[PDB]
Structure 1
Amino acid sequence: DVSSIITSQIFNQMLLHRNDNACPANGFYSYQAFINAARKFSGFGTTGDTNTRKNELAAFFGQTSHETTGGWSTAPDGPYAWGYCFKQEQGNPGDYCVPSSTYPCAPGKKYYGRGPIQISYNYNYGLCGAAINQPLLSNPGLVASDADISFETAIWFWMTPQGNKPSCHAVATGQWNPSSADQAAGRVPGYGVITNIINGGVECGQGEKAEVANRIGFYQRYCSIFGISPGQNLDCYNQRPFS
């Protein structure tokens, strides 16, 4: 069970400032919601030895902290204490509707980034809602109004391979075997390939990038909290994005 690796105190010490009034998602993300959701995904934080389960959770909270960070360079307790500050895409996001007969856009509904993985677009809310048996296509606001659902979308993303792009789960648990194409593209198992899976088109293969360095900093802080050392191949600066 995942609760033997991650306690309420480890969750709270990682997500130290999420409940500050400056965070729009303050009061949303609970340890209970996380454990309820985690238990629905067989293998999630229960694959491998203790250090491998710790590493998976460090990596999962690292990446999701980046997706939702409200941190700045000089924030209280540093930038890597301000994960899980947002539950919806910032700026003025549009409806993120790309029509699908399989996963049709609901009238008046918007599919902008919500929750810990910032799940976006009607196609993804529909694929996800099918997998977790929730009406995300008709009510995408559930991902920001129900914290158990919010965590389910992020773990769903984390556990789901995309053809030649592995699950974050496989990579974080040392179960990803890189293809010859992967090797030629510099995609060596590590946290960097996880950044590549999540947003490599934007962030990877272009040299030093502050968003990548941010993802690493969260993961480094959380490895410390779990009492493990970070893995190798932390960045994707010299990785070709997954096409």
Structure 2
Amino acid sequence: DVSSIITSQIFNQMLLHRNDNACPANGFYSYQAFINAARKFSGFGTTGDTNTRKNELAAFFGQTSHETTGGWSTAPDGPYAWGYCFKQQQGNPGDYCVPSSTYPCAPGKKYYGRGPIQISYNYNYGLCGAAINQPLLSNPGLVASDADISFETAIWFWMTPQGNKPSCHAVATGQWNPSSADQAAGRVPGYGVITNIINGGVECGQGEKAEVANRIGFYQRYCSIFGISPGQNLDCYNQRPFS
């Protein structure tokens, strides 16, 4: 069971400032919601030895903390204590509608970033909704109104290969071997290739970049909280994006 690896105290010590009044999602992201969702994905945080299980949870919280961070340079306990501050994309984001015969934009609905992986666009709400049996295309708001659903979108993303990308799960559990294409692209097993899966097109293969460092900062802090070593190839600075 995933609760044998990550306790409420480990969850809350990682996501220490998420419930400060400054964080608009305060009180949304409960440990119970996370556990309810995580138990629906066999293998999530239950694959390999205890170090592997801890590493997968460390990597998962590392990446999702970046997508939802309310951190800053001079934030209490460091910027890597401010994961999961948000549940909805900041700014005045638009509808994230890209017309699809397969997953149409429900009139009046918006598919901007929601929940721990900031799932975006009607294609992804549709694909995920179909996978987790939730009406996310018609009611994309569920991802910010219901914490179990919110966590389910993020773990769905984590567990699901797409196109030329392995699952984050396969990489995090050491069950991913680079193809010839990946080797030519300098995509090496490690946390950097997880970044590349999530947002490489923007963040990877351009040298030192703030967003990539921030994802690493969270993962290093959580590896320490779990009492494991991060391992190598933490960055995607020299990796060609997948897309």
Same fold per superposition (TM over 0.5): yes
Give the secondary-structure state (helix, strand or coil) at the position aligned to 1:194: helix
Q: Separation in 1 of the partners of 2:98 and 2:88? A: 19
Spell out, residue by residue over 1:70-97, the C-alpha distance to the aligned partner (whole angstroms, 9 max, x if none): 0011100000000000000011100011
Q: Separation in 2 of the partners of 1:229 and 1:73? A: 25
Spell out, residue by residue over 1:190-238, the C-alpha distance to the aligned partner (whole angstroms, 9 max, x if none): 0000000000010001000000000000000000000101011000000
| Per-residue deviation, 1:104 | 1.0
Residue 42 (structure 1) aligns with:
42
Residue 54 (structure 1) aligns with:
54
Instruction: Answer with 212-221 or 163-172: which moved more.
Output: 163-172
Residue 76 (structure 1) aligns with:
76
Q: Separation in 2 of the partners of 1:125 and 1:181? A: 29
Give the secondary-structure state (helix, strand or coil) at the position aligned to 1:105: coil
Q: Separation in 1 of the partners of 2:107 and 2:182? A: 41
Spell out, residue by residue over 1:99-156, the C-alpha distance to the aligned partner (whole angstroms, 9 max, x if none): 1121111110000000000000011001001111111011100000000000000000
| Per-residue deviation, 1:69 | 0.2
Spell out, residue by residue over 1:2-47, the C-alpha distance to the aligned partner (whole angstroms, 9 max, x if none): 0000000000000000000100100100000000000000110001
Q: Separation in 2 of the partners of 1:100 and 1:201? A: 22
Q: Separation in 1 of the partners of 2:89 and 2:142? A: 14
Give the secondary-structure state (helix, strand or coil) at the position aligned to 1:65: helix
Spell out, residue by residue over 1:161-205, the C-alpha distance to the aligned partner (whole angstroms, 9 max, x if none): 012210000000000010011111110000000000000010001
Residue 105 (structure 1) aligns with:
105
TM normalised by structure 1 equals 0.99
Unaligned stretches of 5+ residues in structure 1: none
Q: Separation in 1 of the partners of 2:98 and 2:204? A: 25
Residue 121 of structure 1 pairs with residue 121 of structure 2:
yes
Unaligned stretches of 5+ residues in structure 2: none
Identity of matched residues, %:
100
Q: Separation in 2 of the partners of 1:13 and 1:127? A: 33
Give the secondary-structure state (helix, strand or coil) at the position aligned to 1:130: helix
Residue 160 (structure 1) aligns with:
160
- Moved beyond 4 Å, runs of 4+: none
Residue 180 of structure 1 pairs with residue 168 of structure 2:
no
Computed over aligned residues only, the root mean square deviation of the Cα atoms, in angstroms, reads: 0.5
TM normalised by structure 2 equals 0.99
Q: Separation in 2 of the partners of 1:3 and 1:72? A: 30
Give the secondary-structure state (helix, strand or coil) at the position aligned to 1:110: coil
Spell out, residue by residue over 1:36-73, the C-alpha distance to the aligned partner (whole angstroms, 9 max, x if none): 00000011000100000000000000000000000011
Q: How many aligned residue pairs are there? A: 243
